[PDB]
Write an enzyme that holds these catalytic residues in place. Structure first.
Site, PDB file in Angstrom:
ATOM      1  N   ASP A  46       0.816  -1.222   0.000  1.00 13.35           N
ATOM      2  CA  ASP A  46       0.000   0.000   0.000  1.00 13.35           C
ATOM      3  C   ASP A  46       0.841   1.258   0.000  1.00 13.35           C
ATOM      4  OD1 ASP A  46      -2.914   1.219   1.871  1.00 13.35           O
ATOM      5  OD2 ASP A  46      -1.933   1.818   0.012  1.00 13.35           O
ATOM      6  N   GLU A  63      25.472  14.644  13.023  1.00 15.00           N
ATOM      7  CA  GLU A  63      25.854  14.541  14.433  1.00 15.00           C
ATOM      8  C   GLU A  63      24.638  14.145  15.290  1.00 15.00           C
ATOM      9  OE1 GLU A  63      29.512  17.924  14.358  1.00 15.00           O
ATOM     10  OE2 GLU A  63      27.677  18.455  15.446  1.00 15.00           O
ATOM     11  N   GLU A  69      22.245  13.209  17.918  1.00 17.63           N
ATOM     12  CA  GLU A  69      22.183  13.183  19.377  1.00 17.63           C
ATOM     13  C   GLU A  69      20.845  12.630  19.849  1.00 17.63           C
ATOM     14  OE1 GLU A  69      22.808  17.200  20.389  1.00 17.63           O
ATOM     15  OE2 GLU A  69      25.008  17.094  20.033  1.00 17.63           O
ATOM     16  N   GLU A 128      26.987  13.577  25.705  1.00 17.56           N
ATOM     17  CA  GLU A 128      26.628  14.966  25.473  1.00 17.56           C
ATOM     18  C   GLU A 128      26.255  15.694  26.748  1.00 17.56           C
ATOM     19  OE1 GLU A 128      26.923  17.025  21.585  1.00 17.56           O
ATOM     20  OE2 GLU A 128      26.160  17.594  23.632  1.00 17.56           O
ATOM     21  N   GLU A 147      25.981  10.862  21.728  1.00 22.51           N
ATOM     22  CA  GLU A 147      26.240  11.215  20.330  1.00 22.51           C
ATOM     23  C   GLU A 147      27.214  10.284  19.621  1.00 22.51           C
ATOM     24  OE1 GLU A 147      28.130  14.989  17.915  1.00 22.51           O
ATOM     25  OE2 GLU A 147      26.639  15.448  19.458  1.00 22.51           O
ATOM     26  N   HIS A 171      23.265  18.173  13.788  1.00 23.62           N
ATOM     27  CA  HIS A 171      24.037  19.018  12.886  1.00 23.62           C
ATOM     28  C   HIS A 171      24.371  18.203  11.668  1.00 23.62           C
ATOM     29  CE1 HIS A 171      25.726  20.825  16.866  1.00 23.62           C
ATOM     30  NE2 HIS A 171      24.461  21.148  16.663  1.00 23.62           N
ATOM     31  N   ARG A 216      28.689  31.132  20.053  1.00 19.66           N
ATOM     32  CA  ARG A 216      27.972  30.413  21.107  1.00 19.66           C
ATOM     33  C   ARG A 216      27.010  29.357  20.577  1.00 19.66           C
ATOM     34  NH1 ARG A 216      27.109  27.549  25.570  1.00 19.66           N
ATOM     35  NH2 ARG A 216      24.989  27.690  26.434  1.00 19.66           N
ATOM     36  N   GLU A 232      28.513  23.573   8.216  1.00 23.35           N
ATOM     37  CA  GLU A 232      27.725  22.845   9.190  1.00 23.35           C
ATOM     38  C   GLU A 232      26.421  23.580   9.413  1.00 23.35           C
ATOM     39  OE1 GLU A 232      28.630  22.591  13.768  1.00 23.35           O
ATOM     40  OE2 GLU A 232      28.764  20.498  13.151  1.00 23.35           O
ATOM     41  N   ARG A 263      23.205  23.604  11.948  1.00 20.50           N
ATOM     42  CA  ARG A 263      23.032  23.179  13.329  1.00 20.50           C
ATOM     43  C   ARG A 263      21.598  23.286  13.829  1.00 20.50           C
ATOM     44  NH1 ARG A 263      24.709  26.015  16.936  1.00 20.50           N
ATOM     45  NH2 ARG A 263      25.250  24.418  18.502  1.00 20.50           N
TER      46      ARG A 263
HETATM   47 MG   LIG Z   1      28.137  20.670  16.215  1.00 20.81          MG
HETATM   48 MG   LIG Z   2      27.108  17.745  19.248  1.00 22.93          MG
END
Ligand SMILES: [Mg+2]
Ligand SMILES: [Mg+2]
Ligand SMILES: NC(=O)CC[C@H](N)C(=O)O
Ligand SMILES: NC(=O)CC[C@H](N)C(=O)O
Ligand SMILES: NC(=O)CC[C@H](N)C(=O)O
Ligand SMILES: [Mg+2]
Ligand SMILES: [Mg+2]
Ligand SMILES: [Mg+2]
Ligand SMILES: [Mg+2]
Ligand SMILES: [Mg+2]
Lengths: 443, 443, 221
Positions: B52, B131, B133, B188, B195, B244, B315, B332, B334
């Protein structure tokens, strides 16, 4: 007037009043008060009592501020309960600045402002007939509220009986035998839900009576192992609560909404006034509907409105015109809920009304049948706009409307937004259990 | 090709596979499959197996519509644990219409479609280093998840010791046996948060691996009396989970973002790619952040991005450019979380990327100073727009962007919006306890 | 063995999807599929279209056999991909007859009303019969459905060939007997006892006072 200095001083001594409540309201409609011993009555009456008027800001409060309490002799009442070491009485108050002028940030002073605005337009009185609806829940063993309702009654059905608790009764009885002038009461759609309706009066008196009502209710129900709440939508999947406001303008002691030789017997004024509520609803919703939870009641299927429109007979119209004419000729806004600060709501509504009267605005087509089905698109093509879906949205609209902002006052406005944005900000970052249930195993 | 139907047919026998998993993905990220006995490997290989197709459309499904399954022999895999009665094996499949053409609704076909666009612009490969997590909670006696974490480890902490549990180790050990190319794993910044990073790989092969990954995790987690979850924000007040995506473009097997004698070693091909992400981010968020709960992760205070801007040292930037250059030169992103549907996320991303390259888009100034200090006005007055606050906004935004709409596909776009909107509408009408807590006594 | 309980009960849980057991049928004549006619509309033979027609004819009658228990009619409710109307289509929300895509050898009619609680030997007997009765009497099939079963009204579905299935076991039974072609498909012994047991099952059910009835009335009245 109604009461004079010496009339009050006679009343206090004879009735044996021993504890005065100097009563007022904050931005969040919450009912504040400074309370003095009977012996301080004189200081009070001379307008000499001081307190921290930053209490008006509610939790947005930052710095302290000395202000005066000005009692209003005509708002004097003696509470029927009391009678321990003596009786209790209150005085509703207007907050003044230490320099003798009324404090603007005071909602009661704010309505008196827009009322005077009305008089310049040459009007006599602004009438309100509110229909405040509430839920009664049960208190647990710890004396803590639960989600248990006080009965299983429905719309208007005779319930509960006259043997026992019967809160609604005992409330109306207390109110009536306490100076109030109630019209009728009844059970509401959802189980445990109730509504008392009072005779119309002028904005100020009507707002003061709404604040006293809530209290007397909150009080009575607590006395019967119950918890009253005016929270708009306490429970998902059942009816929410609202406070439709019946509005009417007088000119020279005569209803100005009425007109025999007219269509619907509604005066040109009426039509204009309505026009105003129509174009300001979306921008005054944030005030009439001040809590985050307020918008959970604004969902289709529960009698509560969701679009800007007016009818004489429809499922859930923002505005509706009840049958009666002549003196009873009135406009009813059905958006307003109980959480709202009566003074702020009435002032933001009067203001929108007068605006449409001032600028002779053209009221739109009254809605026939169906705003429910008629999907977004179509509903749009008919000038039917949706109310804000969330407190956030509601705020963005309020902040955009020049006249609505002016209805509040720089101070009231500044702080009201301050509160609401933080209120929303919290609720937005919160991770409710619903999310966990939907996502935790799904992803 | 990594295998030939003969090595497949050969291996299946020498290895005693008794059960084949034909797995594919729905629009909602969910990993699906049709299971057939080994005695039907032949029917599968000849693209004859049906099912289906509308299962791709997820819960917004209406009518049933048959469709074929074409197994990718290069995606053959023999799950390690599987035993008793025999082993199990899998094939990632493409969805074909009963009439030989590829189903436009299949997210895997979609990627392959965008990827082709890339080929037209002469780029050989589009690389991904994700990445992923995730959180690990405990199961109660009933086998039900709890809000209790499997450890109290911290950022890059040596989580679980090599005695017993150590889920992150076993996951990797099993993945490596399955011919995975794991870069490195670690604990993490929150108790129970893990991670595992993969070696870079081509968009399709990597996207496939992500799906397999969450499977292996899920599986082994339970195997250890635990519950794996990739829910972006399981709990309020701690770090959320993100995924990420290190992206890189190749022009004939030679990194096209690298440029030795250049400003930051980033080529103009690169600089444009950044630009495309910048302008579109707000519009592709609804796709990279498909869940209501996704927007609770997009809150200040953690490493998750709340506004658009790239930087080499910040940051919590939406885009970040890591140190390594040469073949290691990458952009990257994020904002993407593990709830996003890998194939869709890459399409929408490749889409914004290429859109910036071909139109020679001018990338903005990279940020450096504390964007946390600059409020709206400050951030706004610069090339710093906020991401979408709620699913609702992310959707409007998304559906406004013509280029991000063509990235998905008419079929995919139609339903994605449908599901998401109802997902939102269900959440909006919900009355959460937080509301009862805040208002039930205040009002 | 795995510490679980399998049920084939049609609708164990209110408000959640029910268990069905669709049946893909096909007739073979001389080792070939009598339903496949590569040249006609939808590659379906005149044989095939007839067969379909009979199922459409006897559906409301055989439903008491293909869906025997009381709980079976709980699944015969709108909203869950279970048919409620006697109709056929190659592609619709919840058709009673669906024609899959596969042609040639795989040409088949799928009957979607059948639930797992039906007796497989009786369900085919009755299903083959409605189908043989169509070929035998060369019955004309109506038009398939486009996309409006749950959308319109019963009076609307009515203003067409689209009748509802029986809404109860008791209703489905009264229909089963009304039909002679269906009764014969079982025969004297099978027929007499099936009816006797089902009628009982039903009287048992209908005299029962349920918790639902107490939840609504116990206080309100
Ligand atoms: Mg990162
Ligand atoms: Mg990370
Ligand atoms: N008018 C009524 O009595 C219905 C009240 C309903 N609770 C409302 O929100 O309007
Ligand atoms: N590497 C990091 O610290 C980023 C992960 C972070 N939990 C986000 O989301
Ligand atoms: N989607 C389906 O498999 C339909 C079966 C459905 N449970 C009936 O009954
Ligand atoms: Mg201040
Ligand atoms: Mg009412
Ligand atoms: Mg009313
Ligand atoms: Mg569809
Ligand atoms: Mg089927």
């Amino acid at each position: 007037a109604k009461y004079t200095r010496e009339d009050i001083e006679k009343l206090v001594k004879e009735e044996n009043v021993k504890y005065i409540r100097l009563q007022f309201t904050d931005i969040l409609g919450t009912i504040k008060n400074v309370e003095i011993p009977v012996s301080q009555l004189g200081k009070a009456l001379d307008n000499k009592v001081m307190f921290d008027g930053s209490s008006i800001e509610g939790f947005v409060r930052i710095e302290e501020s000395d202000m005066y309490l000005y009692p209003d002799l005509n708002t004097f009442v003696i509470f029927p309960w009391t009678a321990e070491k003596g009786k209790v009485a209150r005085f509703i108050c207007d907050i003044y600045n230490p320099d003798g002028t009324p404090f603007e940030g005071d909602p009661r002073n704010n309505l008196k402002r827009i009322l005077k605005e009305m008089e310049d337009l040459g009007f006599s009185d602004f009438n309100l007939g509110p229909e405040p609806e509430f839920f009664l829940f049960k208190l647990d063993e710890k004396g803590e509220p639960t989600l248990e309702l006080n009965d299983k009654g429905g719309y208007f059905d005779l319930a509960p009986t006259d043997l026992g608790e019967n809160c609604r009764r005992d409330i109306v009885l207390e109110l009536e035998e306490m100076g109030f002038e109630i019209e009728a009461s009844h059970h509401e759609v959802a189980p445990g839900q109730h509504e008392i309706d009072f005779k119309y009066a002028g904005a100020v008196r009507s707002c003061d009576d709404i604040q006293t009502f809530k209290l007397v209710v909150k009080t009575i129900a607590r006395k019967h192992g119950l918890h009253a709440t005016f929270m708009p939508k306490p429970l998902f999947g059942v009816n929410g609560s609202g406070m439709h406001c019946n509005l009417s303008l007088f000119k020279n002691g005569v209803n100005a909404f009425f007109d025999e030789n007219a269509d619907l017997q509604l005066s040109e004024t009426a039509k204009h006034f309505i026009a105003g509520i129509v174009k300001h609803a979306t921008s005054f919703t944030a005030v009439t509907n001040p809590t985050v939870n307020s918008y959970k009641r604004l969902v289709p299927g529960y009698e509560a409105p969701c679009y800007v429109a007016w009818s004489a007979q429809n499922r859930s119209p923002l505005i509706r015109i009840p049958a009666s004419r002549g003196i009873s000729t009135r406009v009813e806004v059905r958006s307003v809920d109980p959480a709202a600060n009566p003074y702020l709501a009435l002032s933001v509504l009067l203001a929108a009304g007068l605006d449409g009267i001032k600028n002779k605005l053209e009221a739109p087509a009254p809605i026939d049948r169906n705003i429910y089905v008629m999907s977004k698109e179509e509903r749009m093509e008919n000038g039917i706009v949706d109310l804000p879906a969330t407190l956030a949205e509601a705020l963005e609209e309020f902040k955009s409307n020049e006249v609505m902002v002016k209805a509040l006052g720089e101070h009231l406005f500044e702080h009201f937004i301050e509160a609401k944005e933080i209120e929303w900000d919290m609720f937005r970052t919160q991770v409710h259990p619903w999310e966990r249930e939907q996502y935790m195993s799904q992803y």
